[PDB]
Design a protein around this ligand. Structure first.
Ligand code: HEM
Ligand SMILES: COc1ccc(-c2ccncc2)cc1
Ligand SMILES: [Cl-]
Ligand SMILES: [Cl-]
Ligand SMILES: [Cl-]
Ligand SMILES: [Cl-]
Ligand SMILES: [Cl-]
Length: 411
């Protein structure tokens, strides 16, 4: 039988996510139609005009699609499954200039080069400065007494991690943070005036100036490694560095922010886990927070050929949308998925995507950011208590929290 969903329900409808996560609806698909055609009416496809997509709700199917990038393309339609309904096709395709929306072999070459920026050593070199910054963030928020946890706790450390990785001098971090904040959320009325196109252009201009400067004066950052030729002359051109910086400014910011906000929401809802976190400070917490938060609800692929997936014939040209928010609560993979368990180990969540060519290169930087900020929160505001309900972001594919009023002193 067909799944018990309202007629015309669209799992990428931003109007849903402005209010809630459609948890019951995803669970109904997993039970009754784990691969399900999500029809979309004319003009209501969020920028795609193909009649709908296949909703992918099971973790094993998300992994299969993610591993078979030879069939399931990121380039063909990009990986973001929802824009404003009137977005020009050319503005979707301009996103093919970042690694996330490339197929092999172009993706292979870029990822090999960019690897230089995300070596364990390079990320580990940011540990002590990010730890110092996390403690300062939490101390300053606790001193304010109460306020918006998103803005006073969750927001700054992911941005400082971007700045430290790129070696952005302190006097430039204000403008870098502004550009990065202008990239996300434009379907929400609170951000109706942001201009991601103009921000991206300014960022490219800034980043190409930086590439030209750092080739003269190599510095203790990843930039020197990215633009230095190897034995075979491989390196980012200045404009490719520009597109990488756009990608980093975009990717490195609000998904980690939202994991922090939603991790602390989870702790407010599960006091025994908060008590246990404060005592043991287990770094397994970061992965359970990312599973619980699933900051990217969904990314899509496009089939380059007919492909049979778990008994369903996907046709060439059709989109498949990987609902990480569903897969991360898959009863066949997780023991008690709706239990928040900061000791869950192993934790094979797909919050950073399915394993494969496009697996999040920032995963360990994200986990570090999360572990450092929650240690600082436990140190400086162990007794925080929510004051009022979170305000969610209107987005068809990002799970965002715009605002959350909290009493840091708990009294
Ligand atoms: C909790 C935070 C984060 C989440 C939930 C997350 C989520 C994801 C997901 C789901 C993908 C899969 C892309 C796909 O398969 O289509 C991805 C890829 C990517 N992430 Fe993240 N990410 C996070 C943090 C970061 C950070 C901090 C950075 C960099 C500073 C970053 C940079 C990237 C890049 C560049 C890719 C593309 C990799 C490629 O295409 O080869 N991400 N991320
Ligand atoms: C607003 O647009 C985007 C927002 C976030 C991402 C992202 C990709 C990979 N990892 C983390 C975040 C990409 C685009
Ligand atoms: Cl769509
Ligand atoms: Cl094309
Ligand atoms: Cl848009
Ligand atoms: Cl097949
Ligand atoms: Cl488990």
């Amino acid at each position: 039988p067909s799944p018990n969903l309202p007629p015309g329900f669209d799992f990428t409808d931003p109007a849903i996510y402005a209010e809630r996560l459609p948890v019951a609806e995803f669970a109904e698909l997993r039970s009754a139609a784990p691969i399900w055609w999500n029809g979309q009416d004319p003009g209501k496809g969020g920028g795609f005009h193909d009649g709908g997509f296949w909703a992918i709700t099971k973790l094993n199917d998300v992994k299969e699609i993610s591993r078979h990038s030879d069939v399931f393309s990121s380039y063909e339609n990009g990986v973001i499954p929802r824009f404003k309904n009137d977005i020009a096709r050319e503005d979707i395709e301009v996103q093919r200039f970042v690694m996330l929306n490339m197929d092999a072999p172009h993706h292979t070459r870029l990822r090999k080069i960019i690897s230089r920026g995300f070596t364990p050593r390079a990320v580990g070199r940011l540990h002590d400065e990010l730890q110092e910054r996390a403690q300062k963030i939490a101390a300053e928020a606790a001193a304010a007494g109460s306020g918006d946890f998103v803005e006073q706790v969750s927001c700054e450390l992911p941005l400082q991690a971007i700045a430290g990785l790129l070696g952005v001098p302190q006097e430039d971090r204000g403008k870098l943070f502004h550009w990065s904040n202008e990239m996300t959320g434009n379907e929400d009325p609170e951000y109706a005036h942001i201009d991601p196109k103009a921000s991206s252009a300014e960022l490219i201009g800034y980043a190409m100036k930086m590439a030209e400067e750092k080739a003269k004066n190599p510095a203790d950052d990843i930039v020197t490694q990215l633009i230095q030729a190897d034995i075979d002359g491989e390196k980012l051109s200045d404009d490719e560095f520009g597109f990488f910086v756009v990608m980093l400014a975009v990717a490195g910011n609000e998904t980690t922010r939202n994991s922090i906000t939603q991790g602390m929401m989870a702790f407010a809802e599960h006091p025994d886990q908060w008590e246990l976190y404060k005592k043991v400070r287990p770094e397994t917490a970061a992965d359970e927070i990312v599973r619980w938060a699933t900051p990217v609800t969904a990314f899509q692929r496009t089939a380059l050929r007919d492909y049979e997936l778990s008994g369903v014939q996907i046709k060439k040209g059709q989109r498949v949308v990987m609902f990480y928010r569903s897969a991360n609560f898959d009863e066949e993979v997780f023991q008690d998925p709706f239990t928040f368990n900061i000791l869950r180990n192993p934790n094979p969540h797909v919050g950073f995507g399915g394993t494969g060519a496009h697996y999040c290169i920032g995963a360990n930087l994200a986990r570090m950011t999360i572990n450092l900020i929650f240690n600082a929160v436990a140190d400086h505001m162990p007794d925080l208590k929510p004051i009022s309900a979170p305000e969610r972001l209107r987005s068809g594919w990002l799970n965002g929290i715009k605002h959350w009023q909290v009493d840091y002193t708990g009294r």
